[PDB]
Design a protein around this ligand. Structure first.
Ligand SMILES: CCCCCCCC/C=C\CCCCCCCC(=O)OC[C@H](COP(=O)(O)OCC[N+](C)(C)C)OC(=O)CCCCCCC/C=C\CCCCCCCC
Ligand SMILES: CCCCCCCC/C=C\CCCCCCCC(=O)OC[C@H](COP(=O)(O)OCC[N+](C)(C)C)OC(=O)CCCCCCC/C=C\CCCCCCCC
Ligand SMILES: CCCCCCCC/C=C\CCCCCCCC(=O)OC[C@H](COP(=O)(O)OCC[N+](C)(C)C)OC(=O)CCCCCCC/C=C\CCCCCCCC
Lengths: 265, 265, 265, 265, 265, 265, 265
């Protein structure tokens, strides 16, 4: 009988009063925090539907938190709701793995700087000048003139070749001449063409060596070092001069040779 | 003996009354929340069987929650049911990883805009004009006229080449002429053809250089910058004009040359 | 001594009575739920051994639940059994990841409809007409006549090219003619063949331009738009007419040309 | 002092008696369950060492469970043992992911039947007649005569082309004839050869169209529908008849043509 | 003041005595279990440093368990140590995923037997005779004579082609003859060569059909079934006999034919 | 009624006083730890916005910790907040997997040293001289002159070929001579060229053997060991000397031979 | 009022005294364990900064453990700190997955020995002699002379071909002779060359059979077994002897034959 010779009914009364207190302060704290986030988002920047589900999801989250806290305050065991809610949080955490990976990689590309804005690089077989580095992705304009947006988590997970870091780079040529050409003559013509060029650095190597005895031609290699801004112009100028002086000196560039053994008359 | 000189039977009575209370309010709250979700889904949009298992799964979920909460209120240890239920929730969370990944990537493609509707792009080797960006996927019509639906989580995880972002792009030509052709003559003909075209931008580079000494031809490169809407028309017009003026000036486009050494008479 | 001046033996007696109560109602609820699932599976649909392990696994699951709940009610700590049981549930949840992924993707392919039954599509390099979309997989008959069953989780994870969505598509031709052919003559013959075809749409583009100066031929491109049902017939008809009028007008389709420089007499 | 004016020593005595009770009933229940599993495995089927570690691992598992339950009954905190044991269970659950995935896929291949025993299929680039579908893998004999065992989790994760599902399939031919051949003559000869064959279905399409203007030959395509058992025989018969009637009608099958421009006398 | 009118100091005294009891029995049980594992490992098999860290890691594990159980018995909250220890156990469980996967696959390859010792198989593009199947890997000697050790988890995860399971296999030939050869003559010569061979099974198929009209040759196919031990010898014998009788009957094996159109005199 | 014949109101008063104490010492400890981290970051090194969100995230973390500790001290159940917070921590832990993997691999590349600064290596098909090894990545300059930044977690996960570790390496040549050349003459010329070179190590192997009977040439192999700094110079010198002495001794380097059977007069 | 008619203030006093006791013994045990690890690391082996962060991280870990144990002893709920700390431990556990995988694989490569030091093997397309097997990686010198460091977790995850395990291996030759050559003459010459070699094992197979009727040559195969140390020398000797005796017996090695049909006079 409930003749009240006990204090457990007092404990039950303070439990239901505490549950109603949790409900009403959860409602008003949800309202005030939604108002504060709504005030601090409009002043800074908003998208309409994005800020809508932002404030809505924060409000539903804090309402669900205070509702199951009030259910647990009464005496209802709420561990299944916490299990489903933790599984849903882990699902959202697996969903946002690539985005947060791009964000962490974007932080690392700002702290450590392998490349900066205006530096010709290569990011996994994609070459071009870096325009800007942002939090999720970098934009880079190629030599063709097209803009490529690459996420940061793929930038760091691969090699990042930087062309504009070292001021001195190397050209390489494969000059195929005929088998009947003199080795010393072709070598001294190529040496004169290399040493008569002022933008080829003389303190580095100036290799002119027979590299390969190919199918229809002996291939010479010539490797010269220039500044990184003069590289393509040195390539074009010395290639044109190689062609002009080999045509002037009688050295022939062979076609795809073939021997034919004639039969059946 | 049960002569009731104790209050633990009072505690057991309020436990079984509380368990029955949890059962009946779980039933009526399941009914009212199923009615409210049923009312708010018919007005907005429904598929028949989809809304059927939606309201059914929400109802079975809240019934299972209140049933094992009522079992735990009696004194039955329910941690194994919570373990299996959390494992099933983690299974469903691993199942919905790709869908929620596409949803998060679709949010990022609306906040950050690498591309918009009506902008010729390239999304992992798939080129075409973007029709619309949605929450799970984007539809884009190619130049061939076919519609391709690409999920957003694969859009962000790869490179996204944007052709219609930079207003000025570059053409490139590989003009192969014979070895006997004059370098200066071919170079000045190509320079006249480039400088006589009004849609080629004169403040950018106008490269006409000998690029390669190939197998049966010397390959010239000519690289010119045009507006992004005039690019293909400039390509076609100046290629036709290259062919006409090289035919008029005697410069030959060589066939695949070959040297034959005749033997065995 | 056990002279019973305490109520903890009363508590122990109600614990062992409660444990026996949990055991017997777990047995009879296992029997009644197995009977109800057995009755509701035979009426709807069954496979014999599949329904056998279905009802068997549900019965062993609820028996294991009530047995370790009764062990925990006595005072035996059962957290290790819950740890192994949660690990086994997570193992089964990792096992059913692909199947539930196919199920979720099959729900998304019914809500959002990129394709329907009877619509020629391409699902990751597999083309053919969709027969039916089911919960785990779609069946599609190719043009060759073979039936291909593709799981839905691989359909959504890749590109889904839809041919029968846009009513107007484009043909493309690479017509290789000889270097000696007149550009204007071949261009006006191709223009007459295009403009004399009634199933080629005249409000779209009708490109006939010199596209490429190839190895042994200049390649013209001609790109015309037709309805999606007339596309292959337009291709065949205008290709046959191109061959007939180029044979009638003296324009030659060249063979793989080659220049031979004869040596060694 | 231990003068026993308290009941906590009574509580400690019933705790150590309960711990000894847990130990001895864990021993005898381990013995009886090991005896029951040993009796039910010998009658059904056994491998010697496999059944050895099966009964051994079940016995060590239930002994470890009752030992740490008895340690927790005394008052020793056992949560670290439960943490290591749950980590080991999750390790074994990650180890058995592929096997249980093959088992779940084998259940799905028996409920849904894309293929049955004796049905020529293609399972990820592996073609052959299905012998039997089992719980972990399917065996299929190829046309070459070799037996291939494919796991089910790789069967469902890829495309499963079924050749023997549709009763009517299509042949396709690429008939390359010379440029000098008449289009109408070759087309009417191929039409007569197709319409004179009784196993080619006349209500389907009978395409005979010029498909491609290739390098050294114009390629005709002819596509005919036959029953799925007559397909290869129709292919062989009509290919032999194409060769015989093109040899009889003067239509030539060209060799790899080449134009040679003779120079250097 | 500590005038001892309470029993909580009695409770604290039995807690510190119980903690010291846990420490000393953890030490002596660690010593006895290390002695028992040390005695049962030396008799069976040991590696020196491997058994060293085995007994050492078991001893440090049981010492860490009893130390944090004794810390939790005093009143120090030890849940952070359990969190780090469970994370380390999950790290070791992720580390041993491939090894335990190979072990589970090795159990499945002994229960189910796709192959046994001395059976020519193909395990993911690796062919050879199986020497032995072990718990982590199988060793197989190829036809070249080299020993290849393949882990079991890669064996089951791929296709396992078994050559020595079916006793009857099929040979296939591509016999390319000239266009001028008679179809009936070549077909009856090949039929006589097939029917004059005693190790070719006559109840199976004996296909001799024109398969392909190739570039420079018509390709006949001949497919014959033999026993699995006579297969290569039948191949060699009937190929030599095909060459001898086609040389005797005037049928020519053509070279790579080519048509040359001579120009520029 | 609240006539205060109980001490639970005393317990509630000390709970709310303890909650306010937790709040105020959480505020001042957050302020002091933020001040201490702010003081110890400015002296050592800072980036502005990076140190901003560093101190901000530490402050919000300790404020959230003390707020939900104060909520749990009152009596509000906070296990859902801990579930969401642990899921967010696991999300951030999955996000930082690649970065911490690169950090652990960078520690292993400093403890174990497969390569050091100034040592020509190959890191997954990327060759060049190592400049420096850092905590997340190594920079290495190639022979071309470009700087490549490779993350450490990809360095250790693949092969790391080290060229500059062994002081003695081997050259290999494929010398193709004509079929009519004498084997003994070519072998003794190559042996004289090898034994007349002083930088070829004589205590190692000096192989000069006929390796291959190729399509148009017999290929000799010659394999010689030199020091690792003389390797390319030995290659170039002995290749030039091979060409000079084979031209002097009449041994011919053949072109791509071909037999032609003339038909159709 | 605090007139002290209760023992809960006594309980609070022993709680704050116990918290201070936990703090001071956590400090001195952190100091003593840091001193003991510092003493046992300097004697054995150290790197400076590595041992620095080792002792530092152990000290910060045990200080964080005793600080949050002392916070939980007071009454502050510390489950959020344990959630973040367990998430950070799981992050570090995912970071060290590859390193611990290499360590476990290195243990398996020492217990099971597929290869030892000084044994020519092939580890995933990388061949060479094993120098040493270590805990994280194996070093192996190739035949070229370069040192390759391969991690153990990639060694076990792939095939490991062992050349130096079986003492007897097999050579294989593809001898292409002309169509006009006699089959019996070439077969008996090859049989005499094989049977006149003493290092070819006579109890194994000595296959000399016509293998293939190729494009311009009939290819004979000859397969002989030798010891594993004589294999390359047998290859070279018998290949040179094949060339010498086929040149002496008039058997010709054909060039790439071609038939030419001359047209257009
Ligand atoms: C989406 C659904 C949203 C629904 C939100 C509704 C919020 C409801 C919040 C407050 C309204 C409560 C009105 C009835 C409560 C009056 C009874 C009472 O004054 O309470 C006294 C006893 C205390 O017992 P005690 O101190 O010995 O327990 C120990 C627990 N310690 C340790 C925390 C103290 O309380 C008891 O006996 C338990 C009495 C049973 C209370 C029945 C009301 C339960 C309401 C909903 C259940 C539906 C479940 C839905 C699925 C969720 C699964 C988790
Ligand atoms: C899919 C299956 C659906 C089944 C749903 C059925 C819902 C049943 C809900 C209510 C009906 C209960 C009727 C019997 C209860 C009367 C006994 C009683 O008035 O209760 C008093 C004692 C209290 O004890 P206490 O305060 O000292 O405990 C401390 C627990 N604290 C801390 C929460 C207070 O209760 C005890 O002694 C324990 C008495 C044992 C109660 C036996 C009835 C158990 C029903 C089903 C068990 C089947 C298990 C199925 C598998 C699930 C595994 C989890
Ligand atoms: C696959 C195996 C299937 C086996 C299923 C068998 C089901 C057995 C179920 C019932 C039979 C019980 C018969 C003996 C019980 C009579 C003793 C008794 O009347 O109980 C009174 C005391 C209560 O103590 P308390 O209220 O102060 O505790 C606080 C616990 N609170 C908070 C929940 C109240 O109980 C105690 O002292 C503890 C007395 C120790 C009971 C010994 C019987 C344990 C049976 C099996 C153990 C084997 C373990 C197998 C591995 C599983 C590891 C989890």
């Amino acid at each position: 009988w409930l003749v009240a010779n006990q204090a457990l009914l007092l404990s039950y009364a303070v439990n239901i009063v505490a549950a109603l207190a949790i409900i009403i302060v959860g409602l008003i704290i949800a309202r005030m925090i939604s108002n504060a986030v709504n005030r601090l988002m409009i002043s800074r920047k908003i998208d309409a539907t994005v800020a809508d589900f932002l404030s809505a999801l924060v409000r539903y989250g804090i309402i669900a938190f205070t509702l199951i806290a009030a259910l647990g305050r009464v005496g209802v065991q709420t561990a299944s709701v916490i299990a489903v809610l933790g599984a849903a949080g882990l699902a959202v955490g697996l969903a946002l793995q690539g985005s947060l990976s791009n964000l962490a990689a974007g932080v690392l590309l700002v702290m450590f700087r392998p490349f900066r804005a205006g530096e010709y690089v290569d990011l996994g077989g994609v070459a071009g000048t870096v325009l800007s580095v942002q939090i999720f992705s970098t934009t880079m304009r190629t030599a063709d003139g097209k803009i490529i947006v690459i996420p940061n988590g793929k930038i760091i997970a691969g090699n990042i070749i930087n062309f504009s870091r070292e001021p001195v780079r190397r050209n390489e040529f494969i000059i195929g001449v005929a088998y009947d050409s003199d080795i010393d003559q072709v070598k001294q013509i190529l040496t004169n063409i290399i040493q008569s060029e002022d933008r080829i650095l003389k303190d580095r190597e100036m290799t002119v060596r027979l590299n390969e005895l190919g199918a229809s031609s002996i291939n010479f290699v010539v490797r010269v070092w220039s500044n990184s801004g003069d590289l393509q112009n040195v390539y074009w100028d010395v290639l044109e001069r190689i062609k002009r002086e080999f045509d002037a000196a009688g050295i022939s560039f062979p076609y795809p040779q073939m021997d034919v053994n004639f039969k059946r008359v």
